[PDB]
Amino acid sequence: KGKSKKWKEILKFPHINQCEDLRRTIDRDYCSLCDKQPVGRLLFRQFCETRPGLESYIQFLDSVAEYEVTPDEKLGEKGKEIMTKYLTPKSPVFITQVGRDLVSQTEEKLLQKPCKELFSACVQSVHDYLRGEPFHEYLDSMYFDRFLQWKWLERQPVTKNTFRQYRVLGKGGFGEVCACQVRATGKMYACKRLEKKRIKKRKGESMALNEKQILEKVNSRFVVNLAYAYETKDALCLVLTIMNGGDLKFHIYNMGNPGFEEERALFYAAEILCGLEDLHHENIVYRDLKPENILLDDYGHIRISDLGLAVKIPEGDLIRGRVGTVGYMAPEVLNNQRYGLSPDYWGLGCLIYEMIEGQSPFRGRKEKVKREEVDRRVLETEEVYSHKFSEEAKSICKMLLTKDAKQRLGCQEEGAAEVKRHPFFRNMNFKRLEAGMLDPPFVPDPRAVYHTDDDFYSKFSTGSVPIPWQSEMIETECFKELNVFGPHGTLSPDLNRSH
Numbered sequence: 001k002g003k004s005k006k007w008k009e010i011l012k013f014p015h016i017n018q019c020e021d022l023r024r025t026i027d028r029d030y031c032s033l034c035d036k037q038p039v040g041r042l043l044f045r046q047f048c049e050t051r052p053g054l055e056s057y058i059q060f061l062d063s064v065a066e067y068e069v070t071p072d073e074k075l076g077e078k079g080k081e082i083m084t085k086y087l088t089p090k091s092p093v094f095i096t097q098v099g100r101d102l103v104s105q106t107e108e109k110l111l112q113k114p115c116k117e118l119f120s121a122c123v124q125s126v127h128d129y130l131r132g133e134p135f136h137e138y139l140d141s142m143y144f145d146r147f148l149q150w151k152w153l154e155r156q157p158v159t160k161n162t163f164r165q166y167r168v169l170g171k172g173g174f175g176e177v178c179a180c181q182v183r184a185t186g187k188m189y190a191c192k193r194l195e196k197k198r199i200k201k202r203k204g205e206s207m208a209l210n211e212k213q214i215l216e217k218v219n220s221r222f223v224v225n226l227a228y229a230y231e232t233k234d235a236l237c238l239v240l241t242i243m244n245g246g247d248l249k250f251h252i253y254n255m256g257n258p259g260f261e262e263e264r265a266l267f268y269a270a271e272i273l274c275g276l277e278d279l280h281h282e283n284i285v286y287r288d289l290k291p292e293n294i295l296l297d298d299y300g301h302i303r304i305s306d307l308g309l310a311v312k313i314p315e316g317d318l319i320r321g322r323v324g325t326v327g328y329m330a331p332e333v334l335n336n337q338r339y340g341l342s343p344d345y346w347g348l349g350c351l352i353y354e355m356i357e358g359q360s361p362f363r364g365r366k367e368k369v370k371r372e373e374v375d376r377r378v379l380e381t382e383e384v385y386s387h388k389f390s391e392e393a394k395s396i397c398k399m400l401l402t403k404d405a406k407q408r409l410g411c412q413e414e415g416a417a418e419v420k421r422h423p424f425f426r427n428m429n430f431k432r433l434e435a436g437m438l439d440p441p442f443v444p445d446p447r448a449v450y451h452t453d454d455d456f457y458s459k460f461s462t463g464s465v466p467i468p469w470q471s472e473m474i475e476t477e478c479f480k481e482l483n484v485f486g487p488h489g490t491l492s493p494d495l496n497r498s499h
């Protein structure tokens with residue numbers, strides 16, 4: 001399925017003794033090793049399936065997975081099924097390490113009205129059990145041994161020969177993004193290639209590193225994810241979630257009637273709002289919200305896709321910096337004031353207005369107007385609203401485009417939640433949107449085609465990102481095919497240490 005012919009050789013396990021060094025120097029943390037890291041999760045689960053009794057605790061955990069995705073109308077029926085499979089005195093798969101005391105509390109919260117995070121405490125205590133003896137036993141096992149081999153692979157050098165590069169997907173001041181493919185696994189990504197020459201000439205180091213490190217640590221369904229970072233002779237590359245559906249600028253202006261139906265604009269706004277929330281949760285200010293930085297995936301969901309201008313603000317501090325794009329810079333930025341998260345709500349106002357109207361609020365579409373004058377309109381004029389806005393669209397745009405940062409919607413104690421409560425979004429179910437369970441109102445046509453250096457370079461090129469790399473191995477069935485053990489209760493050669 002797009003894999004090279006030698007992929008099994010490329011991904012050949014190392015012998016287990018070559019992982020001696022890893023064994024000594026890996027934090028032996030349950031949540032990370034048996035839940036968060038996806039290959040570690042599967043291996044810990046495999047191990048459990050060989051110990052009489054533990055497959056109950058995992059079956060239960062899967063049953064709750066299914067519950068947390070179950071709708072409200074059927075939350076009761078499913079809650080009752082789980083109760084009489086796993087938790088009662090008489091249940092067939094009784095789990096004893098969840099208190100009867102907690103069973104009691106949970107029955108009472110149940111018979112009232114089922115609350116999506118109902119088994120909050122029961123899942124917790126289950127993990128409290130699994131992290132003791134079972135986990136420590138897992139560490140003794142063949143199955144962790146195998147995890148270390150997977151980890152070994154995860155850390156192998158990444159170079160341009162790990163990938164193949166195809167069509168250009170997008171372009172910018174500092175380089176271009178192409179569709180690329182991992183040779184060994186066939187998985188598709190987008191490779192953002194930044195010429196070393198341009199970075200140095202423009203002193204773009206900070207921006208490049210900021211972007212890499214922020215994409216590395218953010219994990220949001222509304223922001224492109226980072227899977228690899230590496231260097232070539234002439235470039236620095238980021239391998240990112242592939243977004244094949246075009247950017248919002250294109251979609252806005254690709255019609256008689258530039259501008260969307262409110263339904264659709266609402267929807268994008270909500271997803272972008274969530275994206276902003278995820279970044280703010282980490283104290284990142286984005287600073288460059290504009291339609292060309294939002295892209296669609298194949299299903300019509302969006303992600304914030306460029307973070308060159310984003311920056312981490314230490315807790316309890318403000319930053320200075322007159323950066324951004326003309327027409328999308330907030331007054332406090334244009335005035336070179338110190339600011340925090342506020343400019344992003346300004347940008348969100350700009351995006352909603354433009355999605356509805358088909359034009360920046362301070363700038364006609366294809367209007368010959370100079371930077372100086374746009375900046376002037378941003379600071380000195382109020383924006384106008386046409387017949388195209390419902391009252392609630394108008395309301396939210398004005399509230400987000402309040403010139404004073406301190407008084408602007410989204411910049412109070414509730415943060416983003418205040419924006420989610422605005423009537424404009426009165427129909428939108430955010431919990432489901434945040435869980436990826438709302439279908440978008442438009443699916444894109446797949447038929448369209450739209451010295452101090454060296455130090456910086458080593459900090460940039462860290463290789464594979466652990467969790468994305470493991471998901472890749474699973475998703476592409478490299479895990480399933482290669483994760484084989486010795487036959488009939490023995491060790492495979494890669495695991496024998498007499499070798």
Ligand SMILES: CC1=C(C(=O)Nc2ccc3[nH]ncc3c2)[C@H](c2ccc(F)c(C(=O)NCc3ccccn3)c2)NC(=O)N1
Pocket residue numbers: 169170171172173174175176177189190192193194204207208211224240241242243244292293294295305306307308309
């Ligand atoms: C979103 C976006 C570009 C883009 O297409 N990015 C992109 C990102 C992830 C992706 N996955 N699938 C397609 C895809 C496309 C495109 C672009 C492409 C390559 C670039 F290098 C830049 C670019 O220069 N961005 C600014 C920057 C400055 C400093 C450090 C890093 N970045 C912009 N132009 C733009 O204004 N925004």
